[PDB]
Amino acid sequence: TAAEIAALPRQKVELVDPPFVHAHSQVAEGGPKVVEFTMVIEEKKIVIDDAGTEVHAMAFNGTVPGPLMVVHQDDYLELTLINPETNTLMHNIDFHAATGALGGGGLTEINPGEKTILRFKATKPGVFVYHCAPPGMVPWHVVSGMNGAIMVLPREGLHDGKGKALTYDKIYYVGEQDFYVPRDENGKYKKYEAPGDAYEDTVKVMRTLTPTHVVFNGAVGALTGDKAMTAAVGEKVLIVHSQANRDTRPHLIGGHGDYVWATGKFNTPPDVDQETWFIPGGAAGAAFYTFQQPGIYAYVNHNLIEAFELGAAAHFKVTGEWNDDLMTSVLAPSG
Amino acid sequence: ATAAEIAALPRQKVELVDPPFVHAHSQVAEGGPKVVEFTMVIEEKKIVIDDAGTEVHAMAFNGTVPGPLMVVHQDDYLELTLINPETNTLMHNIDFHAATGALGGGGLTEINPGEKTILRFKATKPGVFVYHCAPPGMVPWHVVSGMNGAIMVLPREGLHDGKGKALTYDKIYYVGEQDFYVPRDENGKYKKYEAPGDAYEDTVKVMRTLTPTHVVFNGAVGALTGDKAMTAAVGEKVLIVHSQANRDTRPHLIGGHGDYVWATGKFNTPPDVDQETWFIPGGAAGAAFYTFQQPGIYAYVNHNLIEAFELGAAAHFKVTGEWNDDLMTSVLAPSG
Amino acid sequence: TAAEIAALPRQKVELVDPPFVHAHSQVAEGGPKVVEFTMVIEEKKIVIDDAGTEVHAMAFNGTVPGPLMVVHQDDYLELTLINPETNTLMHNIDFHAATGALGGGGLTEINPGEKTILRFKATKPGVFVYHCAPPGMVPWHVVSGMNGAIMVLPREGLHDGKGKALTYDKIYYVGEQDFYVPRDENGKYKKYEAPGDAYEDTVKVMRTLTPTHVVFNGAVGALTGDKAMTAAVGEKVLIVHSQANRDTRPHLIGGHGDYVWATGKFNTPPDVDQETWFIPGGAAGAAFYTFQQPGIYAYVNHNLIEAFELGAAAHFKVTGEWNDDLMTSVLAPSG
């Protein structure tokens, strides 16, 4: 009822840039609330590889992917989206978690210098993709980095196939991005004055259905080296993954997905003991894993060409004690 | 069962309807096993697949791309009379993925132009299945020329969710998705050919790129839009059967969900629930059940947005009814 | 503890070339054991099509794909991997079934002239991919056919979703491979005198993400004729299928996948009555089917262009009586 929706507690949340996630509780604290978020849209040039390749990013909250928003089932997510007058394009937002008006895209078309406030009831539990979708140029905005994901946790937290609770110690959000950067006759990636200048050349690359780069956190190596995600032997980690436009097949090298909500929806029992899962373009998925061995792990899109030639590889730096029962080198490489 | 016992089975002739509509049927089976009879004439015809007038020499079952949806119940016998007209220039056959034996029926149905055949198979497994032409050595060319459709073998007790609760749809639509490989001239313009044959070698070359020039619903870009947009109402339960005989797809109802989705298309496999975007592998059909909650226009797409909005894989749903502000509301309309 | 594993019975297994699988028991015979395997790596030219197209294969045990290793859950798989001095590249092995050191790859880097022995506990039941992964040359080795699979059977054998036992009469292993063969400017496939000579050219083809060939058992038509798989009406067959780098969609033409562990993990209930299943690049899946009709069946990757233009098609020669109740030609093709 009206009075009841109006009486719900309102709560503002401070977002954090991916792969990190803002503060939240797995099990809902209190009753349904209208969770408030605010994101400013930034159109800016970003370098995506070691060769200085640029992309005119269209980023929610200034990041590629946009930040992860976490709410519980039946809460209302109320987002204030701002498109500064400094931008040159109209933007909007489609929450795959939302029901109605094309996910909210039909109610949030804001030109540079405008803002809007959209509220929707998170009626279904799971991880969902959210992305910009201006009619007539939906792919262009999405493949320019304008997408993220939200997590709608069941009020009672996560559980496995037989109702046993699954509580993670850590949670990371890996947004995978397929980029389509134009090249000149010589094969060098092109640079442009403004976003629109690249429109035509970019759509041509997009039609080949072959991305020039497939990256995590907006750039080749963004989640490797000193920016590797961390964990410890014995820790339970939830890795949320999304791809707003193209299929992906996540894999923890040296590990597994103990429980994987491959479709991303919590009412659908998770698959177990996964080596490699699949997330279709336009969806988010989530894998729960308890680390057992220390060392550096790689987390990749398992088409290894996309992982190691195109950029779809991240790292996990795990501390702890090695387990010789699980694995041991009986005879080290020798003549 | 003996041909005699099967012959003692009641027979019922069905009049097919063109996709996305489905011929009249009952969700729960009417009595016991029957021999459901269907007839389809194969038509090799030029079709236009986009607003620019791009043409394809289609190979269409019942004259449509996709071929029509045949609906029977588990343990019924599907008896198809397939006709290949004298006017056609190629041999055609049919492989029902729902069938068991002779390459899905393909090895027993090779008919040359001017020939016909009658195949009968027992629909032993419940679910939606793809059917398509498969002439040895020319299989992909016939399939990506539009020679494919789907059938639905309903459980005799109708649909049920993963927990046994009955799932009864008010309406049903069949969306056949087609990947086309159209050759282009040195200017990037699509080529036209006098006879389908003159297109073969050029088309095989494009097919090898594994990159379709068009990915469409019901044979053409925008085919299920405007006055051909599908319809529903707030509160209406709709089953959307989707098939792709040669290539993967990932259906998504923009602004909606797939409340229950048999992503593998098989009814004995519990449906996934609350789906945002599902996946149907090339060579299969899937089905999504959804109860509309909001009025307005919805786009139904293959969620590789480039395929959807650049290649042609987008349909529309016009939904009547009252807006639900509880589910969604514009607190502050776009403003300064 | 080491002492305990040391006290475990050990068994040397003899490997056989795909699509056949070495002798094993569906239900485990006895308590956990350390199952030993040995594989020598062979860099060799293989002819992949009737046009004489060659690939510089990097084959475990001399075949593409490498042989299927079968152990039971909680057994230890101990592999002695050998890289002969006749080879030119360093190789290693990642068992997706293993936990730690990048699936074993970090512990098995052997140069030509070296060997190593790796032992891991097969803690999760299902079929898993294994493949070479030299840092910086991962996809290249994998798409050169250096991959295979293992099956970790539950101690009590296979079961359906409701716990009823599923015992197969025959088992086959189909390893699907995506090759990227360079062509001279005339469209003719190029031939080389050494693996490294093809590197630069091959990487370029790989980046298009478009394979020139997609084959089963290393060559177009490999699993046909003298190598057509066999079964008899009434026989229950398990078809294990793997693809270490790219997606696939298996389909038994004229048949079905009665039970399909699509993710390849036995603890994830199998899908049933499948027409076409999906296996993501970087995984293995398994389908159980009881043949009901005699005749030649084709088994394919259901992107028909990949199956019939690119090479992804195998045959099954089945003996038995035709069942007219299941299918019958009421009127044979006629006027």
Ligand SMILES: O=N[O-]
């Ligand atoms: O499992 N990594 O290739």
Ligand SMILES: O=N[O-]
């Ligand atoms: O929700 N489709 O962009």
Ligand SMILES: O=N[O-]
């Ligand atoms: O069922 N094979 O096209």
Ligand SMILES: [Cu+2]
């Ligand atoms: Cu935008």
Ligand SMILES: [Cu+2]
């Ligand atoms: Cu979307």
Ligand SMILES: [Cu+2]
């Ligand atoms: Cu045909």
Ligand SMILES: [Cu+2]
């Ligand atoms: Cu088929």
Ligand SMILES: [Cu+2]
């Ligand atoms: Cu190697």
Ligand SMILES: [Cu+2]
């Ligand atoms: Cu791997």
